[PDB]
From Swiss-Prot, chain E:
Localization of this protein: Mitochondrion
Residue window of the full protein shown: 75 to 103 of 113
Highest classification ranks of the organism: Eukaryota, Viridiplantae, Streptophyta, Embryophyta, Tracheophyta
Domain of life: Eukaryota
Protein name in UniProt: Uncharacterized protein At2g27730, mitochondrial
Coiled coil: none
UniProtKB/Swiss-Prot annotation, chain F:
Higher taxonomy: Eukaryota, Viridiplantae, Streptophyta, Embryophyta, Tracheophyta
Organism for this UniProt entry: Arabidopsis thaliana (Mouse-ear cress)
Keywords: Membrane, Metal-binding, Mitochondrion, Transit peptide, Zinc
Compartments (UniProt record): Mitochondrion membrane
Full protein segment contained here: 129 to 253 of 256
Official protein name in the record: Gamma carbonic anhydrase-like 2, mitochondrial
Entry similarity comment: Belongs to the gamma-class carbonic anhydrase family.
Entry function: Involved in complex I assembly in mitochondria and respiration.
Gene Ontology BP annotations: photorespiration; response to abscisic acid; response to salt stress; vegetative to reproductive phase transition of meristem
Subunit and interaction comment: Component of the mitochondrial oxidoreductase respiratory chain complex I; element of the extra matrix-exposed domain, which is attached to the membrane arm of this complex. Interacts with GAMMACA2.
UniProt GO cellular component terms: cytosol; mitochondrial membrane; mitochondrion; plant-type vacuole; respiratory chain complex I
Residue numbers binding substrate: 24, 36, 103
Molecular function per GO: metal ion binding
Superkingdom in the source lineage: Eukaryota
Curated annotation (Swiss-Prot), chain G:
The keyword tRNA-binding is annotated on this UniProt entry: no
Subunit structure, as described in the record: Homotrimer. Component of the mitochondrial oxidoreductase respiratory chain complex I; element of the extra matrix-exposed domain, which is attached to the membrane arm of this complex. Interacts with GAMMACAL1 and GAMMACAL2.
Main function: Enzyme involved in the catabolism of H(2)CO(3) but that does not mediates the reversible hydration of carbon dioxide. Mediates complex I assembly in mitochondria and respiration. Binds HCO(3)-. Required for male fertility during anther development and dehiscence to regulate the secondary thickenings of the endothecial cell wall, probably by modulating H(2)O(2)-dependent lignin polymerization.
Tissue spec: Constitutively expressed in roots and leaves, with higher levels in flowers, particularly in tapetal tissue of anthers, inflorescence (IM) and floral meristems (FM).
Protein name per UniProt: Gamma carbonic anhydrase 2, mitochondrial
One GO MF term: identical protein binding
First and last residues shown, out of full length: 210 to 265 of 278
Membership in a protein family: Belongs to the gamma-class carbonic anhydrase family.
Keyword vocabulary terms for this entry: Lyase, Membrane, Metal-binding, Mitochondrion, Transit peptide, Zinc
Lineage start: Eukaryota, Viridiplantae, Streptophyta, Embryophyta, Tracheophyta
Phenotypic consequence of gene deletion: Reduced levels of complex I and supercomplex I + III(2) in mitochondrion. Reduced growth rates and respiration of suspension cell culture.
UniProtKB/Swiss-Prot annotation, chain H:
Keywords, alphabetical: Electron transport, Membrane, Mitochondrion, NAD, Respiratory chain, Translocase, Transmembrane, Transmembrane helix, Transport, Ubiquinone
Descriptive protein name: NADH-ubiquinone oxidoreductase chain 4L
GO-annotated cellular components: mitochondrial membrane; NADH dehydrogenase complex
Ranges in coiled-coil conformation: none
Protein family (similarity comment): Belongs to the complex I subunit 4L family.
Principal cellular location given in the protein's record: mitochondrion
Membrane topology: Multi-pass membrane protein
Source organism (scientific name): Arabidopsis thaliana (Mouse-ear cress)
Length: 75, 101, 123, 494, 29, 125, 56, 100, 55, 488
């Protein structure tokens, strides 16, 4: 389907083309950089997904402690 | 000078050594630690060389970048090794060597 | 060829801040600032557009009253710019924004005074 | 809760089509003008066909939202958004998908100077306008409605004919933004009570009469600007006149419908008690706008100003119908909304035909055109009649049904609203005669060309649609009555 | 037959070391 | 320049200089068309939205007023341009730039001649 | 004029490279930082045209 | 009444700095000196409070604020020198170009 | 200034500081009225909030 | 003993690297043998590398930064809130440095000491974030401020740069003196400078009738100093003049990093200490003044840099509305607003530095940019619509909160001010889009294309600005984490 890897690869390729266009260069100037950008974007998207999962776990632990501290009031 | 290594957040892994000595942490350097060290140092030497071409000092710039990379890579490797010995990072190999010696 | 650039030429005299008189040349229908930048009396790089929205009185010149009646009266925006760019915040009656003065044939021989350049290149 | 749909043709693909077209057109060089034109036109046409298929699978017995598909925002699933349509929004999706290819075809000849930016702006507008009409959430409706401001601003400012477009684009942006800001406040106040913005939940929640009144005022502040109601309608003549032709078509045919759509989707069903309290207030504002703006139209001298001002009077008659709160009034209000988007769009196309050739909008220059452009004169007369709500045209069906629904509630407002039959006839025929009838004036205009093959084809679906609704509105009313009936009954149990 | 610039050669070695080390770093983590 | 103005050659934006034309210290204001095989001499000025026919000759210090079509040797007034004709000038410049895009696309940043030079050098020792 | 054009067109590859580097080196300036260092950068003679071709 | 008297000594120096700002709109060097008077008054506050509370933290901070005051004065006068060197004068009418 | 002017300004400042001493003694002497007035204003607020919650 | 310093490993590394770069620069810039080479770009690349290695050390050592917390307690306090704030500060500094190489090469700004002072101020802001005592807070603030005074006057022959530095030193030293006077009052009244001690002394009482006026005025003066630092009205007039007069990379750096660090200080001092209502009313009234004044003054500007300065003043007003409400969602929204404003400002200053190669100064200089560089005009229009808060761009997020708190804390005058100032801001932002797209000037300015660094940074920030509302979960989660970690 629409995995993180594909979204990241597309974003990285688009980032290399956008950069070339902002510099008035042909869209495909230095194609090996387009390959590098695809790889880096894929890696970044997958790592962002993993980091988001980890963040949620940490937040749940923090929210559990906050609710325990708040429930201590009614003791 | 009174000291206290106790951290705010407790180590989540078996504590092999609470306050490992400097030479003990250096001797605990693993293959991955040396890989991190070498990668940081090599990148730093390369950046020093490439940024030194225009002013004409690629060699001295290479030495400067390599020194920055050597200090940073050694500090990173020490960080990881000491964290493993202290139980802050996953330390399977440290525990396997500890339970035997 | 029945149509020369000399038909549009306007003769003019500018006095530089060191008090020396020079004979400058400009085309009718173009601003006094363009004629002034032809010789480098005013740095063209300091005033590249002829718009009041791109002017901090880098084009300001002083003109005697005899030539001031041969010009349209200063606009509110022009006086605002001149007054605010003054170091003393005082509107000089003989000051005109060179970017807002269009040369015409009735301004032949007009004499203009060019003050010291203000700083214009913002870091 | 993944409320995904089992149908093959769904709303997500329709929303994605013009977006894919725009993305592809991003990367095509401006030297490949033929390819840019073809790709844009084909993307818009496939979107039109897709929407027709959505019509085909519509179920006209249910009052539930159809083709409902859920789209998830956070893996926490607390905030999750839904898309769906009913008999009230289906034809507006269809109208958007139909008008966009017309907008591309109108600028076909100038496409070598417009560039891919023109097509991309219109394709982006299409995506947002389809989405706005397909939203089951107050917050997403808000966010998608403001998104259209950016491309509409660009369209008006870049491709407008003269420098009054600067002021026009400013006024359009600022008025619309102000209105959308009051809607945001109400959305956040609703969210404070209910903890949600899901429309279906809101339709099942009870509001206090005090807070119903207040939230209704907050919705009115945005919708009355969109409609537009007096005295916040003065942005319309500037924006609709200074826009390019296709821009005027989009502005009058689709964007104007968003305020009345917002009255039918949010204010009227969600706050039934406040709606009853403000019914004399809406009746008064609409009646004033109909009488006053019709008389201003009479005294306009610009071709595009007469058509723009006519749009205000037609839209305020729509509000009388929807606030009559019965089958005829709300049914007629939706039909007039659809009819206006065809009639006023066709009328803006007639004026643009004249402007592209002679480059003037002043009525005084024209006249006598029947002797040089009989084809345009005949097509112009037909849409002139449709603008007068002549029986047999699409606009008469909606107009009379609204008057029926208004008469059953208040005979005075139906009487004042029926005065537009006299006034609307006066300015439409005076416009037609001063442009088409009489003698030519060779000192102003001496060289003439009638419509070409592209302009005649452009007018064909407008003639067919106007006739088709005017003689057999049953194909539309049948698919609407179940949703209309439940909108009227919302909030009462007897 | 031989590349003479020594500083260039050392830079090349550093770049290769960085690439192989990054690959090993991924492979062992 | 004989006119006394600065003597740089300025070819402004959206200007089409027809093939085989000679320009020496002339100013062409934006959106003009210079006909093929034309000659613009020192200090001459072509004002904006003007067109010159092919084979025109503009002597030193002469001027082509805006919105006009000129031609001949020496150039003479012919007719005033209509609005549409003047709207078509930047379209001509844009179309020529679109054509030049095809020629720009045929050249990679570097050539491969240096390889031919290398083997020529090797085949000589 | 022929002298400067002939001098340029007959330069070898090595001299072309030397002058390209020099031209890039002296294209802009920082006379403020130079005065801080107490040095005066001088345009190399191979980038200076003879006075007989200068406009004055 | 000892503590109030030392405190009012420091307070008068602080107020004198404020007045010196208020009273020298043509004299930017005196403004810099007024700021130094305020800093001195604050240092005195810290030392007096350290004595009054029998606490050393006020003395540690007084020494560090001394270092900061010296650094501020050195940099401030450097900027004054380059401002004068560029303009040839210290008059306030030559340092008002940036505005609006 | 003249040296005598600096001396006279010092004398005036000495007088000012002795006046400040008198002000400080006056403030110290009226701590009890401040305390008694504060007793009222806080207790009024108590009797007040207590009465306002009886309903 | 050595393992205790694991908590200061990032700072130790960055300081030592700064010393190495200082020595390298001064040794080879004076060398006759290498013909006194300009070293600004060389030391810039090496310093960017140093910042990235510092970031690696800090982010990969999250639990180790809390080691020996009792030994280090009287010096600083490292926690999750500080962890994320410092990561964001290092990222800002790296981006700003990467945006300076074209300026070094083309204007020939050859001073490498520029990079050294930027790195030293980065050290100062890193220490600011972890500050947990009034003394340490003041010291770190002064270090950062002194570095800024020197870099604001870096173009030492320019009238504008010298004027900017002079106003910065006088107004900055004045504000610092006021803040130091507040610290002295608090210390005299409570006998305490540590944030924990101040917390214990001040909680439970606020204004309990017999309020310590010493504590109250210490708080007021410290608040005045903080408000000067964040350029809140009426302590703001130094900002537009210094932003204009400073070299543009300095303006870009001063726009982002100091705000991150000072807001970290404000949170840990006020939200954590306990005087209460007055403190939040201070920020409420200053937020309102900032929004109104920023909107009007920006509407009056004709130069790009001044417009950006006034826009930043208005946006700090919007952010401080979050601190005013004093709830968990208030802190979260403040952090989200800071992050989005920082990325947007980085986008805007990347574009400004790109156009500074052809000396952009006025808004009218951007005429016909949609013809000469259409993709740059689109990228810049996206930034302006994001600044104006038009959904679904990232700028909407911050605007959405403003009204959420206004209807949450029950404040409709704030809501009305927000509606009017948002409309005004929209007008003066879309005026730039009109200039680049709708105008047909007689004279055009052709701009040189930007370098690779700025194009890559611009592409990334523009993709973030257009697409953040599609996947906003990580920022929401991390800011909620930081807001919670302020207390637990
Ligand atoms: Fe001017």
């Amino acid at each position: 389907p629409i995995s993180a890897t594909m979204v990241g690869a597309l974003l990285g390729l688009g980032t290399q083309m956008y950069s070339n266009a902002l510099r008035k260069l042909p869209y495909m100037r230095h194609p090996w950089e387009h390959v590098v950008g695809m790889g880096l974007g894929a890696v970044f998207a997958n790592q962002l997904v993993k980091w988001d999962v980890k963040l949620k776990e940490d937040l749940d632990v923090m929210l559990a402690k906050a609710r325990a501290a708040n429930e201590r009031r009614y003791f | 000078m009174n000291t206290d290594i106790t951290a705010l957040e407790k180590a989540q892994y078996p504590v092999v050594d609470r306050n490992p000595a400097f030479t003990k942490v250096v001797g605990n350097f693993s293959t991955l630690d040396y890989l991190r060290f070498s990668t940081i140092t090599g990148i730093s030497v390369t950046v020093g060389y490439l940024s030194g071409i225009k002013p004409g000092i690629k060699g001295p710039s290479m030495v400067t970048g390599g020194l920055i990379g050597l200090m940073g890579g050694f500090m990173y490797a020490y960080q990881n090794s000491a964290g493993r010995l202290m139980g802050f990072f996953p330390n399977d190999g440290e525990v396997a060597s500890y339970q035997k010696r | 060829g029945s149509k020369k650039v000399s038909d549009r030429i306007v003769k003019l005299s500018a006095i530089d801040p060191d008090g020396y008189k020079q004979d400058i040349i400009g085309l009718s229908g173009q601003t006094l600032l363009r004629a002034l930048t032809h010789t480098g009396l005013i740095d063209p790089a300091s005033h590249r557009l002829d718009d009041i929205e791109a002017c901090s009185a880098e084009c300001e010149v002083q003109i005697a009253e005899e030539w001031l009646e041969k010009l349209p009266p200063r606009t509110y925006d022009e006086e605002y710019v001149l007054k605010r760019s003054s170091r003393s915040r005082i509107l000089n009656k003989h000051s005109r924004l060179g970017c807002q003065v269009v040369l015409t044939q009735e301004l032949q021989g007009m004499v203009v005074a060019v003050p010291e350049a203000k700083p214009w290149d913002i870091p | 809760l993944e409320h995904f749909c089992e149908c093959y043709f769904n709303l997500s693909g329709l929303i994605l089509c013009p977006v894919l077209g725009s993305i592809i057109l991003l990367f095509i060089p401006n030297s490949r003008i033929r390819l840019i034109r073809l790709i844009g036109l084909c993307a818009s046409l496939i979107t039109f066909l897709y929407s027709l298929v959505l019509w085909i699978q519509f179920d006209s017995s249910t009052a539930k939202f159809q083709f409902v598909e859920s789209l998830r925002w956070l893996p926490y699933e607390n905030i999750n958004f839904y898309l769906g349509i009913d008999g009230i929004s289906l034809f507006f999706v269809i109208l958007t998908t139909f008008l966009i290819p017309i907008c591309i075809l109108v600028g076909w000849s100038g496409m070598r100077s417009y560039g891919k930016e023109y097509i991309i702006a219109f394709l982006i507008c299409e995506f947002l306008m389809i989405a706005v009409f397909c939203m089951l959430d107050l917050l997403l409706f808000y966010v998608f409605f403001e998104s259209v401001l950016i491309p509409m601003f660009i369209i008006i400012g870049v491709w407008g004919s003269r420098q009054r477009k600067i002021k026009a684009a400013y006024q359009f942006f600022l008025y619309t933004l102000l209105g959308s800001l009051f809607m945001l406040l109400a959305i956040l106040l609703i969210l404070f009570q209910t903890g949600t913005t899901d429309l279906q939940i809101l339709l099942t929640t009870e509001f206090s009469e005090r807070r119903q009144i207040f939230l209704w005022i907050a919705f009115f502040a945005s919708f009355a600007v969109k409609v537009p109601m007096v005295p916040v309608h003065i942005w319309l003549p500037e924006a609709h006149v200074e826009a390019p032709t296709a821009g005027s078509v989009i502005l009058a045919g689709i964007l104007l419908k968003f305020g009345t759509y917002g009255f039918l989707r949010f204010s009227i069903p969600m706050f039934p008690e406040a709606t009853l309290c403000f019914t004399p207030f809406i009746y008064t504002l609409s009646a004033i706008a109909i009488i006053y703006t019709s008389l201003t139209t009479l005294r306009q001298i610009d071709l595009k100003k007469i058509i723009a001002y006519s749009s205000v009077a037609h839209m305020n008659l729509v509000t009388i119908g929807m606030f009559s709160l019965n089958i005829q009034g709300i049914g007629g209000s939706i039909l007039l909304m659809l009819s206006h988007g065809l009639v006023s769009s066709a009328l803006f196309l007639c004026v643009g035909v004249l402007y592209d050739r002679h480059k003037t909008r002043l009525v005084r220059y024209y006249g006598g055109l029947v002797s040089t452009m009989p084809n345009f004169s005949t097509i112009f007369f037909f849409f002139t009649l449709a603008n007068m709500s002549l029986p047999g045209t699409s606009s008469f069906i909606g107009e009379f049904l609204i008057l029926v629904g208004a008469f059953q509630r208040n005979s005075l407002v139906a009487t004042l609203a029926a005065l537009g039959m006299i006034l609307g006839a006066a300015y439409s025929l005076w416009l037609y005669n001063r442009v088409v009838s009489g003698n030519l004036k060779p000192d102003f205009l001496h060289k003439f060309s009638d419509l070409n093959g592209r302009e005649v084809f452009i007018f064909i679906p407008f003639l067919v649609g106007l006739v088709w609704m005017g003689v057999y509105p049953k194909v539309f009313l049948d698919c609407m009555h179940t949703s209309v009936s439940n909108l009227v009954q919302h909030g009462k149990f007897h | 037959k031989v590349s003479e610039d020594k500083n260039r050669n050392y830079a090349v070695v550093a770049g290769v070391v960085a690439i192989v080390g990054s690959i090993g770093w991924y492979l062992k983590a | 320049s004989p006119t006394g103005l600065p003597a740089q050659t300025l070819i402004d934006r959206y200007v089409t200089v027809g093939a085989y034309s000679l320009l020496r210290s002339c100013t062409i204001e934006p959106e003009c068309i210079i006909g093929q095989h034309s000659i613009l001499m020192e200090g001459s000025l072509v004002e904006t939205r003007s067109i010159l026919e092919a084979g025109s000759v503009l002597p030193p210090g002469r001027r082509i007023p805006s919105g006009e079509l000129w031609g001949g040797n020496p150039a003479r007034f012919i007719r005033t341009l209509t609005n549409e004709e003047t709207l078509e000038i930047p379209k001509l410049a844009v179309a020529i730039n679109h054509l030049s895009g095809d020629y720009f696309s045929e050249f990679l940043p570097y050539s491969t001649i240096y390889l031919e030079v290398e083997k020529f050098k090797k085949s000589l020792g | 004029l022929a002298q400067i054009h002939a001098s340029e067109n007959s330069k070898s590859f090595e001299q072309i490279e030397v002058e390209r580097a020099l031209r890039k080196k002296y294209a802009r300036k920082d006379e403020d930082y130079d005065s801080m260092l107490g040095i005066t950068r001088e345009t190399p003679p191979e980038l200076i045209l003879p006075d007989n071709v200068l406009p004055g | 009444m000892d503590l109030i008297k030392y405190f009012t000594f420091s307070m008068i120096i602080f107020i004198l700095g404020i007045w010196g700002i208020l009273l020298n709109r043509r004299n930017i060097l005196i403004m810099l000196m007024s700021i130094e008077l305020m800093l001195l008054a604050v240092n005195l506050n810290f030392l007096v409070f350290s004595v009054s509370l029998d606490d050393m933290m006020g003395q540690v901070f007084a020494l560090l604020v001394l270092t900061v005051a010296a650094a501020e004065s050195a940099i401030g006068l450097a900027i004054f020198v380059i401002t004068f060197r560029v303009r040839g004068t210290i008059a306030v009418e030559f340092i008002n170009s940036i505005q609006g | 200034v003249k040296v005598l002017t600096y001396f006279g300004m010092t004398l005036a400042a000495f007088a000012f500081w002795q006046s400040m001493d008198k002000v400080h003694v006056w403030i110290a002497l009226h701590q009890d009225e401040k305390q008694e007035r504060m007793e009222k204003e806080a207790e009024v607020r108590r009797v007040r909030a207590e009465l306002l919650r009886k309903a | 003993m050595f393992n205790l310093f694991l908590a200061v490993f990032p700072e130790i590394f960055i300081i030592n690297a700064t010393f190495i770069l200082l020595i390298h620069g001064v040794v080879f810039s004076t060398s006759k043998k290498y013909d006194y080479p300009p070293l600004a770009s060389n030391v810039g690349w090496l310093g960017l590398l140093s910042v990235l290695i510092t970031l690696l050390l800090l982010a990969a050592g999250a639990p180790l930064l809390t080691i020996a917390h009792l030994f280090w307690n009287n010096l600083f306090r490292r926690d999750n809130f500080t962890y994320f704030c410092q990561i964001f500060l290092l990222l800002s500094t790296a981006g700003t440095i990467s945006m300076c190489f074209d300026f070094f090469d083309q204007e020939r700004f050859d001073a490498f000491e520029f990079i050294v002072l930027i790195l030293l101020s980065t050290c100062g802001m890193l220490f600011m974030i972890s500050a947990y005592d009034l003394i340490a807070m003041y010291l770190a603030i002064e270090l950062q401020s002194l570095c800024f005074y020197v870099i604001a006057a870096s173009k030492r022959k320019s009238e504008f740069s010298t004027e900017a530095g002079l106003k910065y030193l006088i107004l900055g030293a004045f504000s610092s003196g006021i803040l130091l006077f507040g610290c002295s009052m608090i210390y005299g009244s409570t006998g305490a400078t540590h944030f924990d001690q101040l917390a214990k002394i001040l909680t439970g009482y606020e204004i309990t009738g017999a309020r310590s006026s010493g504590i109250f005025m210490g708080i007021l003066f410290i608040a005045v100093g903080f408000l000067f630092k964040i350029t809140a009205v009426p302590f703001h007039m130094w900002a537009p003049d210094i932003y204009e007069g400073s070299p543009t990379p300095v303006t870009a750096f001063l726009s982002i990093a100091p705000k991150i660090s000072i807001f970290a200080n404000i949170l840990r001092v006020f939200i954590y200490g306990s005087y209460g209502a007055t403190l939040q009313q201070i920020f409420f009234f200053c937020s309102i003044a900032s929004m109104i004044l920023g909107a009007l003054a920006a509407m009056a500007q004709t130069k790009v840099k001044r417009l950006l300065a006034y826009s930043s003043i208005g946006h700090v007003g919007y952010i401080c509305i979050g601190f005013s409400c004093g709830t968990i969602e208030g802190i979260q929204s403040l952090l989200i607003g800071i992050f989005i404003y920082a990325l947007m400002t980085m986008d805007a200053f990347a574009i400004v530095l790109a156009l500074r190669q052809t000396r952009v100064k006025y808004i009218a200089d951007l005429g016909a940019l949609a013809k000469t560089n259409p993709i740059l005009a689109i990228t810049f229009s996206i930034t302006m619509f994001s600044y104006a808060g038009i959904p679904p761009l990232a700028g909407f997020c911050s605007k959405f909160y403003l009204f959420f708190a206004a209807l949450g804390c029950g404040a409709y005058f704030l809501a009305l001010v927000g509606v009017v100032t948002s409309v005004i801001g929209c007008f003066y932002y879309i005026r730039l889009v009109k200039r680049m797209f709708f105008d047909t000037p007689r004279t055009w300015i052709l701009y040189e294309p930007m370098d690779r660094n700025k194009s890559l940074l611009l592409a990334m920030t523009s993709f973030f600005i257009t697409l953040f509302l599609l996947y906003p979960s990580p920022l929401f989660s991390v800011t909620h984490q930081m807001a919670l970690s302020l207390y637990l």
